């Protein structure tokens, strides 16, 4: 989660396959989801803070 690593993911790496996904909030690349572009921790925090429209605690 080094800075240099953060900017390294924002350039076309000469081939398609080298490209990947980083969290847009903390720069994690271990639990990021395509839909939100956030890691699980950031997703949970933002969901709890109520800053995600329509996202709510699930129970069934």
């Amino acid at each position: 989660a080094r800075k240099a690593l953060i900017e390294k993911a924002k350039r076309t790496p000469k081939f398609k396959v080298r490209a990947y996904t980083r969290c847009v909030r903390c720069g994690r690349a271990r639990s990021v989801y395509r839909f939100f572009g956030l890691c699980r921790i950031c997703l949970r925090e933002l969901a709890h803070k109520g800053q995600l429209p329509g996202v709510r605690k699930a129970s069934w």
């Binding site: 939100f36 956030l38 803070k49």
Partner: protein
Amino acid sequence: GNKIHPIGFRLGITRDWESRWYAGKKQYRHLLLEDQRIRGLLEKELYSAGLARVDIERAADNVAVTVHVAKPGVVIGRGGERIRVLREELAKLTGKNVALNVQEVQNPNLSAPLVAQRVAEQIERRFAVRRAIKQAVQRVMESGAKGAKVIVSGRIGGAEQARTEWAAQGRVPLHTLRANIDYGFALARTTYGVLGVKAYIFLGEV
């Protein structure tokens, strides 16, 4: 331990989302990212004004930002110039003709975030922790506010050992859904590290 977020527990009922808009999977991420950026910029800037809440609305290729402030005098300025440049800033950041709005919070003693930042500033100014907490809880209790609770994290008075202080009075039923408990967290930075302050305020039922 490990109590859950009191706001996230009541998203469905008695509390409402901060961001209110619809977007498909195609463009959810972009809208969320720009919303986060807007919130970051506004929280960085308007801190002096006593920020409460930032509501983001979208209708059709446009953004309607509502800002809850203790004292609108700071945000607006001497003849409504400050807001203008502020608007321009957002207009420069995301080119979708945002429409800034300001709302003043009635009796600022009944807003958990404001109490949070107040106590955080007190901590930052090397105040006495316990006395400040009692004062804060009493002040909240004076203005109705059927319940009040304030918690400080640790590292009290630059000590070597961290410890929670905690103080409350009134009814704070964290376990009931129909509670409408307002929640606020603030972080204080001092020469000897970081402190976390949490404030819950209980206002009626149903």
